[PDB]
Amino acid sequence: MKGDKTVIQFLNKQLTNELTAINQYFLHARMLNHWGFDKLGKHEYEESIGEMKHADRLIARIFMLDGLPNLQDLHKLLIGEDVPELLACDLKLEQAAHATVREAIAHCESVRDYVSRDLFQDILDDTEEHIDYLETQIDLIDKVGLQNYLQSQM
Amino acid sequence: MKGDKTVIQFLNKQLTNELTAINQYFLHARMLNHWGFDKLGKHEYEESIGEMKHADRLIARIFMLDGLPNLQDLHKLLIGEDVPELLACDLKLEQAAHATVREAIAHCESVRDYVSRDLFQDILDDTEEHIDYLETQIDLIDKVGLQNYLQSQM
Amino acid sequence: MKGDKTVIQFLNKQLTNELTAINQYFLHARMLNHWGFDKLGKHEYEESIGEMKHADRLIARIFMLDGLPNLQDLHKLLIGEDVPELLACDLKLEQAAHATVREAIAHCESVRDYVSRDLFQDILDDTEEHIDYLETQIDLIDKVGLQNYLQSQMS
Amino acid sequence: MKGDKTVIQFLNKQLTNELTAINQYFLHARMLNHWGFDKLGKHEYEESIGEMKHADRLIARIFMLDGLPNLQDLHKLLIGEDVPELLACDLKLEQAAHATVREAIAHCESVRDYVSRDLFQDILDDTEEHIDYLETQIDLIDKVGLQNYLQSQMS
Amino acid sequence: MKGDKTVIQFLNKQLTNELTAINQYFLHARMLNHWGFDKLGKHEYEESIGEMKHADRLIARIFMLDGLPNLQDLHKLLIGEDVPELLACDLKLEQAAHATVREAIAHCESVRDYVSRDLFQDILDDTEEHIDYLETQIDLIDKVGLQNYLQSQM
Amino acid sequence: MKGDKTVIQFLNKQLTNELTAINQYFLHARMLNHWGFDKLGKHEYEESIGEMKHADRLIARIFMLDGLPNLQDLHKLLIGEDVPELLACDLKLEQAAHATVREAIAHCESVRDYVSRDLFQDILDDTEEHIDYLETQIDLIDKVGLQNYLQSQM
Amino acid sequence: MKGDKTVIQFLNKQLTNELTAINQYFLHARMLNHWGFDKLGKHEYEESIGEMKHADRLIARIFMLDGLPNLQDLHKLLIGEDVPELLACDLKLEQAAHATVREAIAHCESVRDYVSRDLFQDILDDTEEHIDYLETQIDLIDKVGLQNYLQSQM
Numbered sequence A, B, E, F, G: 001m002k003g004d005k006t007v008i009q010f011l012n013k014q015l016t017n018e019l020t021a022i023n024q025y026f027l028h029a030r031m032l033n034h035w036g037f038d039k040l041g042k043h044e045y046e047e048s049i050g051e052m053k054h055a056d057r058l059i060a061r062i063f064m065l066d067g068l069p070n071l072q073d074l075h076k077l078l079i080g081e082d083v084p085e086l087l088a089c090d091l092k093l094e095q096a097a098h099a100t101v102r103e104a105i106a107h108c109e110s111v112r113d114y115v116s117r118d119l120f121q122d123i124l125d126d127t128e129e130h131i132d133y134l135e136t137q138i139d140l141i142d143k144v145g146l147q148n149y150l151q152s153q154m
Numbered sequence C, D: 001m002k003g004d005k006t007v008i009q010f011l012n013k014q015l016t017n018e019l020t021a022i023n024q025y026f027l028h029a030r031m032l033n034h035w036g037f038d039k040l041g042k043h044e045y046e047e048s049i050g051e052m053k054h055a056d057r058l059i060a061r062i063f064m065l066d067g068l069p070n071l072q073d074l075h076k077l078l079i080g081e082d083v084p085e086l087l088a089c090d091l092k093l094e095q096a097a098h099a100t101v102r103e104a105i106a107h108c109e110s111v112r113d114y115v116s117r118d119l120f121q122d123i124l125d126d127t128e129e130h131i132d133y134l135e136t137q138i139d140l141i142d143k144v145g146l147q148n149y150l151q152s153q154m155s
C-alpha cells in the first residue's frame, strides 16, 4: 500500500531509536553479568529483547507501507561506567525516544494513518512503563543506599 | 428485624472507620509500589482488602437490623510521605478504630445485642493483629536500620 | 515522569467518580441481597468490583505522572428506595461519569498525553456497556412488568 | 455438468429467499439481544446460521450445474417492532419460501433433476420445522400471556 | 443511548461495505472450490467469515446507539472470471471500504464518539492486513508465473 | 583477566561483522515475508537469530578479557532487490566474515589465547555451513529455474 | 600407546596442580561452612569436585599414554584466614595452573599430540571460567562492602 512518506520517516526514526536501545541495553545487560549483578542484568536483557520486538513491528509496518526499513544508522550509545550511570543513560535514551513517538502519533493522526498511530501508541505505553521503572530504580539507590542496592542485584 | 438504634450507630461509626482504612491502605499500597517497595506494598494491599471485608460484614449487619449503612462519610486520611511515616499513620488509624470497637462491644453487651457483639469481637481481633504487625515493623526499622529495612521491602 | 497538571486533575476527577460508583453500587448490591434479589445483587456487586479496578488503574496512572491520588472526596451517593429507582440512580451516575471521561479524552489528546487517553478510552467503553445494560433493565421492567422482573431477580 | 436452466433459476430464486432470511433473522437476533431477550435472540441467531448453510448448499449446487449464483438481490426484509411482530414477520417469510421450494421440487421432478430435488426436499423439511416452531411461539404468547412469554426469553 | 446521527450513518455505510464483501468473498470462495483451487478457496472463505464478524460488531454498535442497522442494501459485487481478476476485484472492494473507514474515524474523532472510533480502528487494521495479503498474491503471480501460482492453490 | 589487546580487537572486528549480519539477515527475512516467500523468510530469520547468538558469545568473551565490546559500528548492509540478489548479498557478507575469523584463529594461536581460538573455531564452522547453504540455493535457482525456486519458497 | 615423555610430564605437572586445588578448595569449602558462609561454601565445594574430575581425566590420559600418574606430590596449599584472603588464595592458585596449561598446550601442538592438546584446552576453558568468577567476587566485595558481601554468603 502507499504509506505517507513522513509516516515512513517517523517509523524509520523510531526504528533507529529502537536499534540504539537494543544495543545499549544488550551491552549494559552483559556488563551487569560481568560485574556480578545478574538480577539487574537479567531485567536489562529482557528490556533489550522488548526493543527487538518493537524494532520487528516497525520493520514489518514500513514494508507494508511500501517503504525501506533503515537498519544501517545508530545513535551514539550512552554507556555507563557503574550502575547509577547505567540507569541514568538508559533513562536519557528512553526520554529521547518518547519525544519521537509522541510526535509520530500526532503526525499519523493528521495524515489519517490511524493503524500506524495504534502501533506508536503501543510503543509509547511500553516506553513510559520503562521510564517509570528507571526513575524508581534511581530513587531506590538513594533510599536503600548504593551498597545495599548493589547487594540486592547480585 | 428492628435493631437498637445506638447499635446501628456504632456499626455505622465503625463502617466510617473501615472505609477510611480501605482508602488509606489502598493509597499507601499503591504509593509503596510506586516507590519500588513491592513486598511492603503487597502486604498493605492485603490489609486494604481485609478492611473491605470488614466493611462488607458491617453493611450486611446494618441491613439486617433495618438500618441504612453510611458509605457517604470518611475520616481525614493520614497519608505518609515516607515509609516510617506511612507505618505510623496506619498505626494511629488502627488505634483510633480499636477504641470505637471496644466501646461498641460494651454497648452491644449492655443492650443484649449479642450477635452484633460477636461481629465487633471478630473485628477487634483482626485489628489487634494489624496493630501488633505495625508496632513490630516500626521497631524493626530501629533494629536493622532504615536502609536495611527498605532494602528488605524491594 | 512530570504529567500535565490538567491531565492529573482529570484523572482525579474521574477517580472521585469511580469512588462514588464503588460505594453506590456496593451499597445497592447489599441492599438487593437484603431484599432477596440476589441475581441482580450479584451483578450489581460485580459492577462495584469493576469500579474498584477502574479506580486502581487511575491511582497507578496518577502516581506515574508524579501527582497525588485523591481518595478523600466523594460525590453525593444516589441511593434508590426500590429496584426501579436503584437502576435509574446507577444510570444517572454513569451518564455523569461518561461526560467527565469524554472531556478528559479530548484534553489528553490536545496536550498529547496519549497513554492517559488510552486509559480513559478503556473506561469510556466499559461505561457505555454499563449504560446500555442499565437502559435495557429499565426497558425490561416495562415489557415483562415489575412483578415478573423482580421474580426473575430472586435466585 | 449442464444443468436445466429452469432448475438453476429455481436454485437462484430460493438463494434470494435464503439471503433475505439470513439478514432478517440476523437483524432480529441482534435486536432481541439489544432488548435483553437473549434466549430468543440465541435461537433466532441459530436460525440465521441455518439459512447461511442452506444458502451455501444452493450456491455449491448452482456452480456444479454450470450456473452463476445470484448474491446481488434480496427481497424486502420484514422487520418487527416488538417480539410478537418479529415472530409474525419470520413466519410470513418462511411461508413464502415454502411456496418456492415446493414449486421447485415439482419442477426438478418433471425435468428429472433428481439430485436437485433432494436438496430442495431437505430445505423443505427444515422450513416446515421452522414454521412449526414459529406458529407454536405465537400460540404460547397467547396462552402464557406476553409478559410471561418475554420473561421466559430474558436469560 | 442517543448516538450521533452521522456516526450511525457511517456505521451503516460501512455495514453496507461489509455485507457486500461477505457476499463477494463467499461467492469467490465457492467459485475457487468449483475451479479446484481449494487452498485459495479456504482462505477466501475465512475472509468472508471475517467480514460477517465485522458486520456483527457494526450491527451491535448501531443498536447500542439507538439506530436501525441497514441489512437491506448492497453495493454492486465485483465478480472475477479468473483468479487474477478475482484477486483484483477483492483488492478494489477493500480499497473502497478503507476510504469509508478512514472518513468514519475522522468523523467519530470530531464529534467525540470515541468508542465508535475504536471499533472503526479495529476494522481499519483488519482491512489493511487483507489489502497487504491481496497485493502480495497479485505480485506473486508475476514472480512465480500464473501456472505455478494456480498449481500452488490446488 | 587481561586479554591480549589484538585478540580483543579481533573479537570486536568479528562482533561488527555479526551485528552487520544480524541486521542484513533480519531485514532480508522481513523483506521475504513481505514478498510472500515465507519459507525462505523463516530460514533467513533463523540465520539472523544465529548471528545474535554469535554476537552474544563475542560480547561475553570481550568482557571476560577486560575489553569493551563495540556495538556502535556497522558495515554497509548488502541489501538485495530480488531473491537471487538477496542470496548473493548474504554469500558476500559471510565470505568477508570468514576471512576475519580465519585470521583471528591464527592470531589467538600465536598469543596462546587458546580459549578465544575455540570460540572463533565454532564461529568458522557455522560460517562455512551457512556459505555452503547459500552456494547450494544459488545453484538450485539455475537447476529448477527461478519461477519454480520462488514457488517452492511460498 | 607410547606417549611423548614431555607430554606425560606436562600431564603430571597439571595433575599436581589439580590435586593441590582439590585440597585447597575442599578445605576452603569446609572452612566456609564452619564460618556459617554456606552459600559460598557450597560453590567452593563444587569447584573442588570440578578439580577432582579434571584430575580423573589427566590420570586416564596418562595411563593411556603408558605413563604412571603422580598422586604423590602436592604444592603448598594457599590457605586464607578470612573470606577476602580465601578468594585471593584461590585466584593465585588458578593463575599458576593457567600458566602450566597454556605451556602444555603449546608443547602438545609442537609434538603433534593433538588429543592431549584437546584435553588441556577443556581444562584451560574451565580454569578461565573459575578465574573470572573469583575476580568478580573480589570486585563485588569492594562494591557492596565486605559486611554485605558476607551477609549474602550466609
Ligand code: HEM
Pocket (backbone or CB within 6 Å): A019, A022, A023, A026, A049, A052, A053, A055, A056, A071, F019, F022, F023, F026, F049, F052, F053, F055, F056
Ligand atoms: C535488528 C536488530 C534486531 C532485531 C529486529 C532482533 C529481533 C529479535 C527477536 C524478534 C528475537 C526473539 C524475541 C522473542 O520472541 O523472544 C530476538 C532474540 C534475541 N536477540 Fe535479537 N534482534 C536484533 C538485534 C540483536 C542484537 C544486536 C543482539 C546482541 C548483540 C541480539 C541478541 C538476541 C538474543 C540473545 C536473543 C535471544 C534469542 C534466543 O536465542 O532465544 N539481537 N531478536
Ligand code: HEM
Pocket (backbone or CB within 6 Å): B019, B022, B023, B026, B049, B052, B053, B055, B056, B071, C019, C022, C023, C026, C049, C052, C053, C055, C056
Ligand atoms: C465500599 C467500599 C468497598 C467495599 C465494600 C469493597 C469490597 C470489596 C470486596 C468484598 C472485595 C473482594 C474481597 C475478597 O478478596 O474476597 C474487593 C476487592 C477489591 N477492591 Fe474493594 N471495596 C471497597 C472499596 C475499594 C476501593 C476504594 C478500592 C480502591 C481502588 C478497591 C479496590 C479493590 C481491588 C483492587 C480489589 C481486588 C479485586 C479482585 O481481584 O478480586 N475497593 N472489594
Ligand code: HEM
Pocket (backbone or CB within 6 Å): D019, D022, D023, D026, D049, D052, D053, D055, D056, E019, E022, E023, E026, E049, E052, E053, E055, E056, E071
Ligand atoms: C448479515 C450478513 C451475515 C452475518 C451478520 C453473518 C454472521 C455470521 C457469523 C457471526 C458467523 C460465525 C462467525 C464465527 O466463525 O464465529 C457466520 C458463519 C457462517 N456464515 Fe454467515 N453471516 C452473514 C451472511 C452470510 C452469507 C451471505 C453466507 C453465504 C452463504 C454466510 C455463510 C456462513 C457460513 C457458511 C458460516 C459458517 C457456519 C459455521 O459452521 O459456524 N453468511 N455468519
Ligand SMILES: [Ba+2]
Pocket (backbone or CB within 6 Å): A148, A151, B148, B151, G148, G151
Ligand atoms: Ba544489607
Ligand SMILES: [Ba+2]
Pocket (backbone or CB within 6 Å): C148, C151, D148, D151
Ligand atoms: Ba411469572
Ligand SMILES: [Cl-]
Pocket (backbone or CB within 6 Å): A151, B151, G151
Ligand atoms: Cl539482604
Ligand SMILES: [Cl-]
Pocket (backbone or CB within 6 Å): none
Ligand atoms: Cl419463571
Ligand SMILES: [Fe+2]
Pocket (backbone or CB within 6 Å): A018, A021, A050, A051, A054, A123, A126, A127
Ligand atoms: Fe521500544
Ligand SMILES: [Fe+2]
Pocket (backbone or CB within 6 Å): B018, B021, B050, B051, B054, B123, B126, B127
Ligand atoms: Fe477492619
Ligand SMILES: [Fe+2]
Pocket (backbone or CB within 6 Å): C018, C021, C050, C051, C054, C055, C123, C126, C127
Ligand atoms: Fe468505572
Ligand SMILES: [Fe+2]
Pocket (backbone or CB within 6 Å): D018, D021, D050, D051, D054, D055, D123, D126, D127
Ligand atoms: Fe433455509
Ligand SMILES: [Fe+2]
Pocket (backbone or CB within 6 Å): E018, E021, E050, E051, E054, E123, E126, E127
Ligand atoms: Fe471487514
Ligand SMILES: [Fe+2]
Pocket (backbone or CB within 6 Å): F018, F021, F050, F051, F054, F123, F126, F127
Ligand atoms: Fe555468525
Ligand SMILES: [Fe+2]
Pocket (backbone or CB within 6 Å): G018, G021, G050, G051, G054, G123, G126, G127
Ligand atoms: Fe582444574
